[PDB]
């Protein structure tokens, strides 16, 4: 199963892309 | 790639900003009922940390997911490792991976933890 590492480097990108 | 972090990555700590974030993220689903994957990505952040009661609440996050998750155990077992060796329980972290590298002999990146870990040992005893 994909890693929670993974997980992790995949949600923060995202995140700073939603701020304002 | 990759499977986990480096021991270097886990010394270098967030910009204050993303670790709110990933905080945030914790408060958005209730804290302690938030899911597995929210809690390790704050407890990894918080051991990323130079402050030692960000580095310990990460590390008892990363236990509470260690407790119930079996399919994540094995994984976790690293981060362990490096949250202890950050805290200066060398004995604590030298259990863990031992148990890690029972199961992954062959893996690269534990036995480059597990290297670091003695060598620590060994210059702090010594």
Same mark, same amino acid.
């Given at each position: 199963?994909? $890693?929670?590492?993974?997980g992790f480097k ?11 | ?13 967030? !910009? ?11 408060? $958005? ?8 994957? $929210?809690?390790?990505? !704050? ?5 990323? $940390? ?15 997911? !260690? ?24 004995s604590?972290?030298?259990? !863990? ?30």
């Amino acid at each position: 199963e994909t $890693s929670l590492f993974q997980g992790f480097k995949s949600y923060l990108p995202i995140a700073e892309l939603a701020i304002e | 790639v990759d499977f986990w972090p480096t021991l270097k990555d886990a010394y270098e700590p967030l !910009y204050p900003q993303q670790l709110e974030i990933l905080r945030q993220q914790v408060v $958005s689903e209730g804290g302690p009922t938030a899911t597995i994957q $929210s809690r390790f990505n !704050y407890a990894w952040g918080l051991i990323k $940390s130079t402050d030692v009661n960000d580095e310990r609440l990460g590390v008892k996050i990363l236990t509470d997911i !260690y407790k119930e998750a079996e399919s994540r155990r094995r994984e976790c077992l690293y981060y362990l490792t490096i949250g202890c060796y950050k805290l200066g329980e060398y004995s604590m972290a030298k259990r !863990y991976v031992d148990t890690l590298f029972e199961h992954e002999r062959n893996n690269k990146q534990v036995g480059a933890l597990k290297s670091m870990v003695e060598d620590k040992i060994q210059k702090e005893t010594l």
